[PDB]
Design an enzyme around this catalytic site. Structure first.
Site, PDB file in Angstrom:
ATOM      1  N   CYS A 425       2.265   6.803   1.187  1.00  0.00           N
ATOM      2  CA  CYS A 425       1.190   6.240   1.996  1.00  0.00           C
ATOM      3  C   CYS A 425       1.640   6.207   3.453  1.00  0.00           C
ATOM      4  O   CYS A 425       1.861   7.261   4.058  1.00  0.00           O
ATOM      5  CB  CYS A 425       0.802   4.840   1.509  1.00  0.00           C
ATOM      6  SG  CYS A 425       2.171   3.680   1.273  1.00  0.00           S
ATOM      7  N   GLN A 472       3.431  -4.670  -2.539  1.00  0.00           N
ATOM      8  CA  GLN A 472       3.611  -5.538  -1.379  1.00  0.00           C
ATOM      9  C   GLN A 472       2.935  -6.899  -1.504  1.00  0.00           C
ATOM     10  O   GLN A 472       3.483  -7.899  -1.029  1.00  0.00           O
ATOM     11  CB  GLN A 472       3.085  -4.841  -0.119  1.00  0.00           C
ATOM     12  CG  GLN A 472       4.071  -3.886   0.522  1.00  0.00           C
ATOM     13  CD  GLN A 472       5.253  -4.607   1.133  1.00  0.00           C
ATOM     14  OE1 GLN A 472       5.125  -5.258   2.168  1.00  0.00           O
ATOM     15  NE2 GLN A 472       6.412  -4.497   0.494  1.00  0.00           N
TER      16      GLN A 472
END
Ligand SMILES: C[C@@H]1OCC2(CCN(c3cnc4nc(Sc5ccnc(N)c5Cl)ccc4n3)CC2)[C@@H]1N
Length: 491
Positions: A425, A472
């Site tokens: 990403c 995350q």
């Protein structure tokens, strides 16, 4: 290996009073932000006053306001505790003394009836498995239940923990400021019964591994919050994963990192061989005949050639891109592929874009990768560019992600001797970790159906030991559960 400086349950006023009455100048703690859900606050005492530094995490990294971006809160605190004058009117703030939390909320072993505890330790417990629960009769007291050893060769021993003047003890000996210190002490110096049985505190009782068919019931339970408690219990274990990242910190490699403090672990980093320091790329092998993964960052202009060196060297035949090139006005990944029907040379690597196919959720690019001057090195690389991940948070429905991964999985399985699937990403830890974790869990279910155990936090912790901060946010944590639940429902 200590994350005691994180207090999951205190408020800003509570943090301020705690630092002013129990800390000194240089004392600090971290806490969830109450005003901004999903964010965090670093509260630091200095000159007899407390400062509150915002830490944002939208899903890609922990963003310290007026500071740097980090992969975990533990790596953040370790950095500033070891680099004296980085944290900042440009005024230096020193992280010197972690103010330790006494709340046992985030401990794996803290939870509960005595019968139910016996039931859990009976069914999924092992020798040395233990838990701590609130006492049945005596309020404020606690019980340590330990399994040692259905024929009487194993037993469950209960040990009463009295709370007297905010200190804990097992009826004699030392008095501890917290259940954590008590458990830590009797982990190292185990209790011995009169007839010789050693109450070894070997490992917490697993409560997160469940049968695949029970996931819907578990998700219902976590949503009643159980999700936040389980996620933060997972987050506390990140202090066990502060492995070295020296290669990424070398002068020659600093500019090869999208974010200077988000670095690959040395022991799992992808090592680039046969170079023109030319062996570095911000990327890690992720290992769960299962497929493996390379988790990496979005390319910089000066790392495009290294990216293709990596893809070629590791024999990767599939790339998963989980970001647009530009999101919310910011560059997340430089275009490292040619336009359709075009051919480009990236250093010694040659890439032709054979054809593009557009679905709603993604674009598929059929790429032909080879080394210049060697026509026999050609192989097809299938780039799956996911383009509908929202700017804020996670998708409301996991269907697009699940259909995407199913297609990706079958392309990979159709290719003999294909290498690891490259997933990236922006920083390569948030969305990248989310996709990889979902893919790992879904592959277990795809091969065994509902007759399999899955353990979402254990899988994440295992992946987090191979790249910093994989997965995350709590929102992503919830999304993994929802994606696994949806996949099981449509079997
Ligand atoms: C007060 C709250 O009540 C329940 C409570 C949260 C849910 N429960 C748990 C237990 N264990 C957990 N381990 C992990 S991480 C892990 C998982 C499996 N295996 C390994 N090896 C690791 Cl490291 C992550 C989350 C976990 N949540 C029980 C404890 C809270 N304390």
């Amino acid at each position: 290996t200590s994350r005691r400086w994180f207090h999951p349950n205190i408020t800003g006023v509570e943090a301020e009073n705690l630092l002013l009455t129990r800390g000194v100048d240089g004392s600090f703690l971290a806490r969830p932000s109450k005003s901004n859900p999903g964010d965090f606050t670093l509260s630091v005492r200095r000159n007899g006053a407390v400062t509150h530094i915002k830490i944002q995490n939208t899903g890609d990294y922990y963003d310290l306001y007026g500071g740097e971006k980090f992969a975990t809160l533990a790596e953040l605190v370790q950095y500033y505790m070891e680099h004296h004058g980085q944290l900042k009117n440009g005024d230096v703030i020193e992280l010197k003394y972690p103010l330790n939390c006494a709340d046992p909320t985030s401990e794996r072993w803290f939870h509960l009836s005595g019968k139910e505890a016996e039931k859990l330790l009976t069914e999924k417990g092992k020798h040395g498995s233990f838990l701590v629960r609130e006492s049945q009769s005596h309020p404020g007291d606690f019980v340590l239940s330990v399994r040692t050893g259905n024929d009487g060769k194993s037993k469950v021993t209960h040990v009463m923990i009295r709370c007297q003047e905010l200190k804990y003890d097992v009826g004699g000996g030392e008095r501890f400021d917290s259940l954590t210190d008590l458990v830590e002490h009797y982990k190292k110096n185990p209790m011995v019964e009169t007839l010789g049985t050693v109450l070894q505190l070997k490992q917490p009782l697993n409560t997160t591994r469940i049968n695949a068919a029970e996931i819907e019931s578990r998700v219902r339970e976590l949503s009643k919050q159980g999700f936040w408690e389980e996620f933060e219990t997972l987050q506390q274990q990140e202090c066990k994963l502060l492995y070295s990242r020296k290669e990424g910190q070398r002068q020659e490699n600093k500019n090869k990192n999208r974010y200077k403090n988000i670095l690959p672990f040395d022991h799992t980093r992808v090592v680039l061989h046969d170079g023109d320091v030319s062996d570095y790329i911000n990327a890690n092998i992720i290992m769960p005949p299962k497929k493996s993964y390379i988790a990496t960052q979005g390319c910089l202009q000066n790392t495009v050639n290294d990216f293709w060196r990596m893809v070629f060297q590791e024999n990767s035949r599939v790339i998963v891109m989980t970001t647009k090139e530009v999101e919310r006005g910011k560059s997340k990944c430089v275009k490292y592929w040619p336009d359709e029907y075009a051919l480009k040379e990236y250093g010694v690597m040659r890439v032709r874009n054979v054809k593009e196919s557009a679905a709603h959720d993604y674009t598929l690019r059929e790429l032909k990768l080879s080394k210049v001057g060697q026509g026999n090195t050609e192989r097809t690389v299938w780039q799956y560019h996911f383009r509908t991940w929202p700017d804020h948070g996670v998708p409301s429905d996991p269907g697009g992600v699940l259909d995407f991964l199913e297609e990706v999985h079958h392309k990979q399985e159709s290719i003999m001797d294909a290498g690891p699937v490259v997933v990236h990403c922006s920083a390569g830890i948030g969305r990248t970790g989310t996709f990889i974790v979902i893919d790992i869990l879904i592959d277990i279910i795809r091969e065994k159906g509902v007759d399999c155990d899955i353990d979402v936090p254990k899988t994440i912790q295992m992946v987090r030991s191979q790249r910093s901060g994989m997965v995350q946010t709590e929102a992503q944590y919830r999304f993994i559960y929802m994606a696994v639940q949806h996949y099981i429902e449509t079997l």
